[PDB]
Amino acid sequence: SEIGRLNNQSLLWGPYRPNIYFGTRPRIGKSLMTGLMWGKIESYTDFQHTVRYTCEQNEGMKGYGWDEYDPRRGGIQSIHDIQNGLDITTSFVKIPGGAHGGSWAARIKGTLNDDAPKDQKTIVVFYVSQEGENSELEAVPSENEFGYEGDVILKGRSEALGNYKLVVTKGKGVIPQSDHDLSRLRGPGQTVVQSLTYPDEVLWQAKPILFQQLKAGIDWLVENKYDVADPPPPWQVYLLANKPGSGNVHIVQKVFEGDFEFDILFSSESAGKEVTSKDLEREVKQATEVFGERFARVFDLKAPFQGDNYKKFGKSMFSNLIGGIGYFYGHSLVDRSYAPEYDEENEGFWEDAAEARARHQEALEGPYELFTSIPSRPFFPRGFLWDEGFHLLPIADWDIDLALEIIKSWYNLMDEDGWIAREQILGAEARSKVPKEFQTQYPHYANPPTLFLVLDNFVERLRKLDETLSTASVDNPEVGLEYLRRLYPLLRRQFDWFRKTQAGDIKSYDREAYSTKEAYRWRGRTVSHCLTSGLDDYPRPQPPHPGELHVDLMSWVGVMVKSLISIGSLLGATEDVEFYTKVLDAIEHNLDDLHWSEKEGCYCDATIDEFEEHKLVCHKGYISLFPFLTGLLKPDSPKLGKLLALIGDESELWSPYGLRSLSKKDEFYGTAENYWRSPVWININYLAIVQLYNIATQDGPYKETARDLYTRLRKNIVETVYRNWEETGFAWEQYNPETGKGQRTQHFTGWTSLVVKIMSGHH
Ligand SMILES: OC[C@@H]1[C@@H](O)[C@H](O)[C@@H](O)CN1CCCCCCCCc1ccco1
């Protein structure tokens, strides 16, 4: 309980709003949040198009991301904005102390790029909001008439945070001055604050709230005879009238000519002395040193990636992955009808289930909270179930206590039946990034249980103060077991939930096999898709059919039983461990009996035919290697070796750039949206690389073959991601097997980042 409270205290504050360029919030649903906004202003209508706040990716932004980050300490973020001619640094640092989760500081630095006019006007805004019934926040008024010559001090109080002061410093930088008649009523130009109150649930809507104030300002100009005959400068037209006070929103605005910097100092009163700029500098410096030392220890790049170029690459892939960590809070949209159509028991079941959806029974439920890393800051800044399985493997290396926090956070969402929604859209803010048609979660929709992989890694570590806290759950085996003891019931619940809801039909067709129980079929499939599997458009038996069996799903169950055995063993759940052992046995046999093709030489999904007999439907690709990817095969398996032939074969899956999702020989190669139908995906490649390495480092028939493919596949995967990073600055969602080019979505960190773990090795 001691270590648990120390983690709470340590992880409370962070820049946990990955959906915006820069902002802070604690791991409290209703509390204090900050956000940064900037935009050049050249005209009377331009700011609304230039201003930046939520993350996007267009021709306007060269790139951005974290150059170093640890959620316990802070980090530095770099933003390269073409539209606004600015290179921005956002440095954030945490100062432990008091009872309330410590303090923190940020420095915003903006440098004009060579293209920007030397005399650019740039509007910067710091937006602060506080939710809660019994909380207060006040801007201390200034001496001077029209705004601030110096720092803005906000004093606030809340049950969650105690007393605090949030200071936005005067800054370095030329501040432009107006000789217009308006300066008599608005001042010649200075820092300003507007204190406002709105009903709590709209506070997150910083852009509209801001724009509403600017609009009222411009309206006031027009009411008071300032016109096109003789107008003030644009930048003065968009400077807000100063009106500090109290409210649950505080708009702090500055305008700069040329380069600029300013600081935010959040001072927890319950702590010792208040935070200073000089403080922020020291801690920024200190954090970097610590980051540096830990990176070289945890991510020791092995040949041929020992070079500094690869080190910068790793540091970028790592910092963006871990930097995506967010805290989200609010209601989810869930259909709790449990319509019978979602049982998908009929032929044509996809029209049945569409009819139930068209009943629109869903409603908001919760609130819920989640602490999680995300795949994509610009496009999907939210938790995806099987994604997090992958995100946490490098994170777990860095800070196992951290990863366990995230696992806990995920498992806390599980409902009474055993279900966790595979996509976590929590609260109005999260919903703003998502069409309503795609918000609704479905209690019958699974997602690969990849979080079990991280537990598997923790379990091997457990067998064999920011320093202490990162590893406290492995260094103190009592602590480690107590975690598993508490988690175990939930793991088991989820296992049962898969077998209850994702069951395949053996007994009701002409199907002979060693076990009558073991067969699985992903609920949720449409004619062309099966989103729940993770592999959107990978070809599946056509037409979809309740007699389908999916070899990937079965292998995922295998992944879970094996973990339940390890974790059960460790807690001594003897009754349980024996159930597992009979299940793992049956899956082993059943994988072969239901999914093995001796003709094709790989594992296939199955359906039942027109004549009601079990057919194999083989599509040589990731799906076909699943038992191997998930480590279910014995190292001397004849089948394994046949699969090694497939993996290595250039005319099938082996591209210079990684394993192709689908074989070049399959009819569905590069068809339709071509999502999982040729491209190279780093997450599944990572599984292939890990499993090759296992075979390569053991006595057995395939040792040297596995070793060769490990060597080359590692090389191809790392190089492809790195060349693309070098050329484009980005991690990509997937990679083109013909050109090697990164495609689909940028800023995918995201499981692409597994590249730092591939390079560093000693699995
Ligand atoms: O990383 C999560 C998820 C993985 O779990 C799956 O394995 C993967 O197959 C698909 N990805 C991405 C899902 C994208 C969410 C849909 C809203 C995005 C809107 C858009 C579409 C184009 C650009 O923006």
Distance 522 CA to ligand 1 centre (A): 18
> CA 656, 661, 664: angle at the middle one, nearest 5?
70
**Best mutation site among 373, 377, 379 for ligand 1, i.e. most ligand atoms within 8 A of its Cβ?**
379
Distance 668 CA to ligand 1 centre (A): 21
Of the candidates 692, 617, 589, which has an alpha carbon nearest to the alpha carbon of residue 648?
A: 692
- Exposed / middle / buried, residue 1 (Cβ in 10 Å: 0-12, 13-18, 19+): exposed
**Best mutation site among 533, 536, 749 for ligand 1, i.e. most ligand atoms within 8 A of its Cβ?**
536
CB 319 within 8 A of CB 65: yes
For residue 376, the ligand 1 atom closest to its alpha carbon is 1
State the DSSP string of 168-198: E---EEE-----STTHHHH-SS-BEEEEE--
Give the tokens for residue 40. 């050049």
CB 153 within 8 A of CB 140: yes
How many Å apart are CA 175 and CA 197, to the nearest integer? 29
Give the tokens for residue 726. 């070098």
Going by alpha carbons, the residue nearest to atom 4 of ligand 1 is 534
Going by alpha carbons, the residue nearest to atom 15 of ligand 1 is 380
Instruction: Provide CATH code, domain 13-298.
Output: 2.70.98.110
Going by alpha carbons, the residue nearest to atom 19 of ligand 1 is 379
For residue 386, the ligand 1 atom closest to its alpha carbon is 5
Distance 65 CA to ligand 1 centre (A): 20
CB 49 within 8 A of CB 138: no
**Best mutation site among 372, 380, 438 for ligand 1, i.e. most ligand atoms within 8 A of its Cβ?**
380
Distance 379 CA to ligand 1 centre (A): 8
For residue 536, the ligand 1 atom closest to its alpha carbon is 9
How many Å apart are CA 174 and CA 137, to the nearest integer? 30
How many Å apart are CA 626 and CA 646, to the nearest integer? 12
Going by alpha carbons, the residue nearest to atom 14 of ligand 1 is 380
CB 90 within 8 A of CB 263: no
For residue 422, the ligand 1 atom closest to its alpha carbon is 5
- Which residues contact residue 365 at a Cβ distance below 8 angstroms, ignoring those fewer than 6 apart? 331, 332, 334, 336
How many Å apart are CA 284 and CA 302, to the nearest integer? 29
Going by alpha carbons, the residue nearest to atom 13 of ligand 1 is 380
Distance 107 CA to ligand 1 centre (A): 33
Q: Which amino acid is residue 586, in one-letter code?
A: A
Distance 376 CA to ligand 1 centre (A): 9
Helix (H) or strand (E) holding 64: strand 61-70
Using alpha carbons, list the distances in angstroms from residue 271 to 35, 163, 267, 626. Answer: 24, 10, 8, 53
First to last CA, the chain: 31
Give ligand 1 pocket residues (Cβ under 6 A): 375, 379-380, 384, 386-387, 534, 536, 745
Largest CA distance in the chain: 91
The SS3 call for residue 84 is: coil
Going by alpha carbons, the residue nearest to atom 1 of ligand 1 is 375
Residue 750 preceded by cis peptide, ω within 30: yes
Of the candidates 313, 297, 295, which has an alpha carbon nearest to the alpha carbon of residue 305?
A: 313
Of the candidates 735, 746, 727, 719, which has an alpha carbon nearest to the alpha carbon of residue 684?
A: 735
Give the tokens for residue 545. 């059919």
How many Å apart are CA 510 and CA 519, to the nearest integer? 14
Contacts 24+ apart (CB under 8 A), 78-85: 79/21, 79/22, 80/113, 81/38, 81/52, 82/113, 82/115, 83/40, 83/50, 84/38, 84/39, 84/40, 84/50, 84/52, 84/116, 84/122, 85/40, 85/112, 85/113, 85/115, 85/116, 85/117, 85/120
β-strands 103-112, 249-268: how paired? antiparallel
Going by alpha carbons, the residue nearest to atom 20 of ligand 1 is 379
Of the candidates 292, 260, 254, which has an alpha carbon nearest to the alpha carbon of residue 76?
A: 292
Of the candidates 299, 186, 256, which has an alpha carbon nearest to the alpha carbon of residue 38?
A: 256
For residue 535, the ligand 1 atom closest to its alpha carbon is 9
Distance 383 CA to ligand 1 centre (A): 11
How many Å apart are CA 479 and CA 486, to the nearest integer? 11
Distance 723 CA to ligand 1 centre (A): 24
Q: Name the resolution in angstroms.
A: 2.8
Length of the chain: 763
CB 722 within 8 A of CB 293: no
Domain boundaries, the chain: 13-298
Going by alpha carbons, the residue nearest to atom 24 of ligand 1 is 379
Residues facing 166 on adjacent strands: 154, 266
Going by alpha carbons, the residue nearest to atom 21 of ligand 1 is 379
For residue 447, the ligand 1 atom closest to its alpha carbon is 5
For residue 531, the ligand 1 atom closest to its alpha carbon is 9
How many Å apart are CA 80 and CA 61, to the nearest integer? 6
The SS3 call for residue 32 is: strand
Helix (H) or strand (E) holding 431: helix 427-431
Residues facing 24 on adjacent strands: 34
Distance 536 CA to ligand 1 centre (A): 9
Distance 17 CA to ligand 1 centre (A): 19
CB 692 within 8 A of CB 763: no
Give helix 574-595 / helix 551-571 axis angle, nearest 10°.
160
After which residues does the chain have a break in its backbone, defined as C to next N over 2.5 Å?
Answer: 464
Going by alpha carbons, the residue nearest to atom 7 of ligand 1 is 534
CB 425 within 8 A of CB 361: no
Active site members: 536, 733
Of the candidates 72, 73, 89, which has an alpha carbon nearest to the alpha carbon of residue 81?
A: 89
- The torsion angle over the Cα atoms of residues 225, 228, 230 and 234, rounded to 10 degrees, is 100
- Exposed / middle / buried, residue 674 (Cβ in 10 Å: 0-12, 13-18, 19+): middle
How many Å apart are CA 155 and CA 250, to the nearest integer? 11
For residue 748, the ligand 1 atom closest to its alpha carbon is 1
Torsion-angle region of 631 (φ positive above 0: left; ψ -120 to 50: alpha; else: beta): left
Q: Tell me the H-state helices in 464-548.
A: 466-475, 477-501
For residue 434, the ligand 1 atom closest to its alpha carbon is 17
The SS3 call for residue 538 is: coil
Give the tokens for residue 753. 């980042």
3-state secondary structure 380-409: ECCEEHHHHHHHHHHHHHHCHHHHHHHHHH
**Best mutation site among 384, 420, 674, 676 for ligand 1, i.e. most ligand atoms within 8 A of its Cβ?**
384
Distance 387 CA to ligand 1 centre (A): 10
How many Å apart are CA 690 and CA 692, to the nearest integer? 6
